[PDB]
Amino acid sequence: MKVLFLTANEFEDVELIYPYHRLKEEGHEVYIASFERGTITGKHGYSVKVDLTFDKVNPEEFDALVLPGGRAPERVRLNEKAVSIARKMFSEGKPVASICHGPQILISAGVLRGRKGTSYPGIKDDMINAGVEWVDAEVVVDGNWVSSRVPADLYAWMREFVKLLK
Amino acid sequence: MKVLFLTANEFEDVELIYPYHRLKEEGHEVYIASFERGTITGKHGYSVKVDLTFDKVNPEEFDALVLPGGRAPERVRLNEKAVSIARKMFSEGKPVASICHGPQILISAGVLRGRKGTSYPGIKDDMINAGVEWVDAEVVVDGNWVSSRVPADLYAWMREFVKLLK
Amino acid sequence: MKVLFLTANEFEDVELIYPYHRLKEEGHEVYIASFERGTITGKHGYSVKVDLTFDKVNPEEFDALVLPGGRAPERVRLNEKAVSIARKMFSEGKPVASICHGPQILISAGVLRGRKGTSYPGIKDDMINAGVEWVDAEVVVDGNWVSSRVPADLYAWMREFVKLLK
Amino acid sequence: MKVLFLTANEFEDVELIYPYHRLKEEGHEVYIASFERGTITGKHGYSVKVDLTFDKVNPEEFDALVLPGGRAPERVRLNEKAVSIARKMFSEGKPVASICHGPQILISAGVLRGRKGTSYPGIKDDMINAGVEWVDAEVVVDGNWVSSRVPADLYAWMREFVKLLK
Amino acid sequence: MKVLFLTANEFEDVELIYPYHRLKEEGHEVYIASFERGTITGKHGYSVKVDLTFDKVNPEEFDALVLPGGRAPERVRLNEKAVSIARKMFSEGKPVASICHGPQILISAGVLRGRKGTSYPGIKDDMINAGVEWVDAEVVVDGNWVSSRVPADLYAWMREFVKLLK
Amino acid sequence: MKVLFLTANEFEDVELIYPYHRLKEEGHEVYIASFERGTITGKHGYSVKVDLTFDKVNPEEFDALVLPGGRAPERVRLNEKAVSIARKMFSEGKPVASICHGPQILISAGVLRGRKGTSYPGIKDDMINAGVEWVDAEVVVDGNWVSSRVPADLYAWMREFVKLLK
């Protein structure tokens, strides 16, 4: 299965790298999409290469979506193309994994009303204002949406997402 | 007039330091409140001393509120006392100045429903979801609430807030 | 009134940003001059755009001068044009505001002989050797020359300078 | 199964965090052992808590071993107790996973003569001089020893190690 | 011969470390004096241990003095005890080596009028105002005073100072 | 005498800068060779200019070799040309000075069997596996090979190497 990542500079390093490798282990093809070609750098200094830009992404060519946290979501959520990618994939019922600030992108896509999930505790009120029934758990599974809160939840986060992709 | 600042570590340096000195110039007494006594450090390294903790703050003792941006608001908005301080002061109609991520505290206080203002563009969707008519202006004045977006707006931000306190 | 700033990379961030916005608030036009066009970065990481180079600066076109501190003055004071700009404006009796290491430029301009002011305490001996009656005060006003010591003096610094420009 | 990690300050962040969560996903208990109690910080800034010190480790109480890379191995390999732990566990046939500089600890344990595996290419000559049949592959499996080279190999590294612990 | 170093946090790393070892090579005993016991850290991150505090130093117990550059001199020159140490040793005709900002300490000691030397070009005007006939050379030898400008002058700087100590 | 330095990015700053100036003091010509032209930066941030690339180096055109430590050796030792340069110069009996991780390049050159010397203690086992009679001393002299362990050994390191070039 082809998994797409929507991220940018200042992403939370492990929230991108962990799922990237965890999914590759299963045989899934992983792709990193961002504003421009070249590379992006995490808040901790890890550098990763961008596979394609938001503009070149066709939501229909991917089967799953992963939204890492960090400061990147606040910039990504202002990009019409990136938000539409997430809106389409999420609404189509495709698997979507989010952690930390990653769901800010889904908030902006306007697809979370009535959904159940979690996020970085610091933005729980924004998730709630978007219609999310917020849960304080290491991992929440709501249909196609698997969400976690912080790096400490990584193990549980992909444990559930991997199952969904099987 | 006694002005209270609700902030913490990782505050946007100039968004705290600028209004602090600008108001001090007018003769106003400025107080920095945070989680604990001692000092706090901004995103850029500037250090400032804390005057009193959130718990020791009595809203009735202060006449105006300033909410600097940065990453601090996302931690401060999780403190019940800090949020109650903002809710009370804002509700009483006391002058409240916010910039960047600062209004995330007002979102959590539940006082922005039906109000008009601005903020860091990255969280405009969260402001909208809280009931704010979001304006893309360097400074917005809605009754007692004076709001701005980024450091580039500093001059207009305090220009309007100072008038409110006159 | 048109205010000129002589600075460069490694300027003390708030000593540049504070007066820039404070004066802009009053309606004054503020211009940043440095070695080359583009942008310069302060000791703490803040970035600001350069309006014009020292070479393109015509002293007769500006009404006031601001000299921020940091490590920048020690590089700026070695630029003949920059020093001549300061010498002319100061000599003409135009308002000149300096803080921290900023007056090192005035020392090099040779205009402080017999004047009274202050600066970062670390260079008081250099100010004295240049003929300055050094005062340990948050702000000193000597005719057209308004001087301060450290970031903690910002409020008093511009409070007096603004009056001079009124 | 109880998995022990031998590491210290300046460990390669993801080479410790990735296996830590990947193994926890399977239900294995993971323990971080280092020089002293408290916390240790990776080269990229991630902080992890130390569960026990080398001195308090009883090799017989753990079932598997993980050796992350970074600069930590060159310090850990100088601690006779830490090296004795690795020698004991490795020679007993217990599963041992190494990556990057991690195997420097095994070189010092004197248990690699005649074995096959890999490591950070920069120290391949040292692995060879220690009797290793060095292979340039993302992952090598030689009995109880699963080895990899760099962070890009993470997915294959744990893919194989997990199979060993099953 | 016993050589004393007057420095503090933020010293230019190589301007302290180079002469320290270069003189030890000759068999001279080297001592690091600063504000407090423990260690100090250079601007580049090198950490060195303090042998004794300024207060515990007896100028008569040392035969030569070295003044590294960096930001440390601006803090050291405000310490009455440190300045008196330099004033006494320099006036007694003992060998004194200075580089970069190091001579700011001698300026404050008030012993440079009429002397010939150099320093970081950025403070040449302050050296001149102190009565120094400033020379732009990698190394200047004026009796007991050997001075240089920047790290690039290190080889020439100690080449001359070593001769003086022979 | 013409002294060649084999190094690269992340070299231990003082282990390159110290011998560079100490040797220049004697009148020796020093040349920095690395992967590409331009500049290289030490682990602590010091920048030095590259005089020539490994590819353009003719071992016969240089009389002595210096191998600084840091992380650079582990990358340099993977460059077949750089390693061939060290092998040639070392086996020809030309003076060679190494410190810290510097000798990893000599291990890869295959010229240390039966030789006596030292290095960063962290890689002593690798030096031993390469046939070295490892000695724990600030400086070791074995014919044309002068070796040291850490920055604290600098004074003794060059004291002995200088004697060799005399």
From Swiss-Prot, chains A, B, C, D, E, F:
Catalysed reactions listed for this entry: N(omega)-(1-hydroxy-2-oxopropyl)-L-arginyl-[protein] + H2O = lactate + L-arginyl-[protein] + H(+); N(6)-(1-hydroxy-2-oxopropyl)-L-lysyl-[protein] + H2O = lactate + L-lysyl-[protein] + H(+); S-(1-hydroxy-2-oxopropyl)-L-cysteinyl-[protein] + H2O = lactate + L-cysteinyl-[protein] + H(+); N(omega)-(1-hydroxy-2-oxoethyl)-L-arginyl-[protein] + H2O = L-arginyl-[protein] + glycolate + H(+)
Swiss-Prot/TrEMBL keywords: Cytoplasm, Hydrolase, Protease
Molecular functions per Gene Ontology: peptidase activity; protein deglycase activity
Protease as UniProt keyword: yes
Keyword Protease: yes
EC number(s) stated in the UniProt entry for this protein: 3.5.1.124, 3.4.22.-
Residues of the PfpI endopeptidase domain: 1-166
Domain of life: Archaea
SUPFAM superfamilies, per the entry: Class I glutamine amidotransferase-like
EC class of the enzyme, as a word: hydrolase
Pfam families (alphabetical): DJ-1_PfpI
InterPro entries: C56_PfpI-like (IPR006286), Class_I_gatase-like (IPR029062), DJ-1/PfpI (IPR002818), Peptidase_C56_Deglycase (IPR053435)
A cellular-component GO term for this protein: cytoplasm
Signal peptide (residue range): none
Family: Belongs to the peptidase C56 family.
Protein role: Deglycase that catalyzes the deglycation of the Maillard adducts formed between amino groups of proteins and reactive carbonyl groups of glyoxals. Thus, functions as a protein deglycase that repairs methylglyoxal- and glyoxal-glycated proteins, and releases repaired proteins and lactate or glycolate, respectively. Deglycates cysteine, arginine and lysine residues in proteins, and thus reactivates these proteins by reversing glycation by glyoxals.
PANTHER family: DJ-1 PROTEIN, DJ-1_THIJ_PFPI FAMILY PROTEIN
Protein name: Deglycase PH1704
